[PDB]
C-alpha cells in the first residue's frame, strides 16, 4: 500500500518513512478514542494504524465505551471548550471520572505509547504505567470554559506531549510540547478514490437530485456548530440569482454525539417551501456516496462556526471542488481566501460567493486545481504519518 503514494508525494516521503519507521520497529503503540463507527478520527484511524503496521509498528487501537450520560457529558464538555460557553454541573466531573475508572479496568495501556485523541479518554493518564503519553486533541480550545478547560488541563499537564491540529490551538498554560500536525486524508481510501461518472450518477439519481443542474454540497452531521440552518439561508438569498442551483446536505449520526436532531427539524423548517433542498441522512461508512456527491457538487460548503480541522473541506479540494469555508479553527489552512475557496462570517457573505463561483467556470476551475495541489502539498496521509512517527521519535527520546 505505502509504495502506492508515490505517484502523489514522491520516493523522498517513502523513504523517509521507512527509515523513521525502523528506528521504532521495537516500541509498541496503543491509539484510544470514543468511536469506530465512522467519520473524523474513526476514519483517520482506520487508514493510519494498518499503514503503520505495514511499516512493521506493533499499532493497536482500542475504543472506549459509556453510557448515553457519559456521552452527554463529553459532548457537553466538546462544546463548552469550542464556544467557552454552557452551565456545567458538578455532577458532570464525577460521571466522566467514573467512566475513566471503567474503561481503565477494561484497556490495557502497558504500551512504549499511548495516543489518547480528544477529551473523552483524556482522565486515563491517571491510570498510566511507564510509557510516553500524547494527548491528541482534535479540536478547537483556544478559547475554552474555563472551568472544563481547568479540569481537563489537570490531565493533560501529566501528558509528554501534545498535538493540536493548528498553531493557533496551543495554550500559554501549558509546559508540555504542544506539536501542531494537521489531519490528512488518504486518495486511496473509498471517500477519496477515482470513481467512473456511472457510479456518481447512479448515487445522485437513487437520492431524487438533478445531475443536469449546479449542486451545492455540505457534508456535515446535523450539528449546531456545522450551521446548516445558516447553510439553507446562503442558499435561499443565492437562489434568487442562480435559479437552477439545488442544495444537497449531506448529514450521518456520531457514536459520540446525542444532541443530533431538532436542528433536522429546525433545518427541515428553513428549508420549507424551497424543492431544490435536499436534506440526506445515511448511515456512517457511506464513504462512496459521499465521494460520489462531492464529484456531482459544483461548489462545495463547510460553513462551520467552530472546527478543529474539517476532513470535508480537504476532501472536496482534493476533487477539484472550490470550497466555501466558516472563517475559523482550521478550515483557514484549508481555504486560501480567493485561492482554494472563500472563508465567511455569515450566511450573506457565503450566499455572495456562492453567486460569483456559479457565475465563473474558469475562476471555480481554477480554485478547485489550486485546492488539490494545496491538499497534495499538506493535507495527504503520508505526510501525517510521515509527522506522527518523527513526534514519536522525539517525545520517547524526551521522556527516556
Ligand atoms: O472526539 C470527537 C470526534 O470529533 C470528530 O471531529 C468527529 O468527526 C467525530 O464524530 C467525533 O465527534
Ligand atoms: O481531526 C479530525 C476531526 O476531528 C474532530 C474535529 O471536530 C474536526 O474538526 C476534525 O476534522
Request: charged fraction near 25%; glycine fraction near 8%.
Amino acid at each position: 500500500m505505502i509504495e502506492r503514494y508515490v505517484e502523489f508525494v514522491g520516493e523522498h516521503e517513502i523513504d523517509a518513512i521507512f527509515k523513521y519507521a525502523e528506528k521504532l520497529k521495537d516500541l509498541s503503540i496503543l491509539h484510544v478514542n470514543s468511536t469506530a463507527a465512522g467519520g473524523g478520527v474513526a476514519e483517520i484511524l482506520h487508514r493510519l494504524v494498518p499503514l503503520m503496521r505495514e511499516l512493521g509498528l506493533n499499532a493497536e487501537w482500542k475504543v472506549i465505551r459509556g453510557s448515553q450520560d457519559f456521552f452527554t457529558v463529553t459532548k457537553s464538555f466538546h462544546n463548552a471548550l469550542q464556544t467557552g460557553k454552557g452551565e456545567i454541573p458538578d455532577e458532570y466531573f464525577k460521571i466522566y471520572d467514573e467512566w475513566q475508572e471503567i474503561n481503565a479496568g477494561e484497556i490495557p495501556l502497558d504500551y512504549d505509547v499511548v495516543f489518547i485523541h480528544d477529551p473523552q479518554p483524556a482522565g486515563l493518564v491517571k491510570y498510566r504505567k511507564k510509557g510516553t503519553w500524547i494527548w491528541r486533541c482534535h479540536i478547537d480550545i483556544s478559547n475554552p470554559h474555563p472551568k472544563v478547560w481547568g479540569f481537563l488541563r489537570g490531565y493533560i499537564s501529566k501528558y509528554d506531549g501534545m498535538i493540536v491540529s493548528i498553531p493557533e490551538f496551543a495554550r500559554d498554560d501549558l509546559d508540555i510540547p504542544q506539536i501542531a500536525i494537521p489531519p490528512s486524508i488518504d486518495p486511496l481510501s473509498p471517500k477519496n478514490m477515482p470513481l467512473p461518472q456511472t457510479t456518481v450518477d447512479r448515487i445522485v439519481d437513487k437520492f431524487g437530485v438533478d445531475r443536469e443542474r449546479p449542486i451545492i454540497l455540505q457534508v456535515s452531521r446535523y450539528d449546531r456548530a456545522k450551521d446548516p440552518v445558516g447553510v439553507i439561508e446562503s442558499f435561499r438569498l443565492a437562489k434568487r440569482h442562480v435559479p437552477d442551483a439545488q442544495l444537497v446536505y449531506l448529514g450521518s449520526p456520531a457514536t459520540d454525539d446525542p444532541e443530533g436532531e431538532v436542528v433536522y427539524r429546525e433545518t427541515v423548517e428553513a428549508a420549507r417551501g424551497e424543492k431544490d433542498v435536499h436534506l440526506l441522512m445515511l448511515p456512517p461508512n457511506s464513504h462512496v456516496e459521499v465521494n460520489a456527491f462531492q464529484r456531482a457538487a459544483t461548489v462545495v460548503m463547510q460553513k462551520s462556526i467552530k472546527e478543529g480541522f474539517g476532513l470535508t473541506v480537504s476532501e472536496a479540494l482534493w476533487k477539484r471542488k472550490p470550497v466555501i469555508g466558516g472563517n475559523t479553527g482550521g478550515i483557514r489552512i484549508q481555504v486560501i481566501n480567493g485561492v482554494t475557496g472563500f472563508l465567511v462570517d455569515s450566511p450573506k457573505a457565503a450566499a455572495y460567493y456562492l453567486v460569483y463561483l456559479l457565475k465563473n467556470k474558469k475562476v471555480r476551475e481554477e480554485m478547485g486545481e489550486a485546492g488539490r495541489d494545496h491538499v497534495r502539498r499538506n493535507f495527504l496521509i503520508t505526510q501525517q504519518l510521515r509527522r506522527y512517527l518523527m513526534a514519536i521519535l522525539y517525545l520517547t527520546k524526551r521522556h527516556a
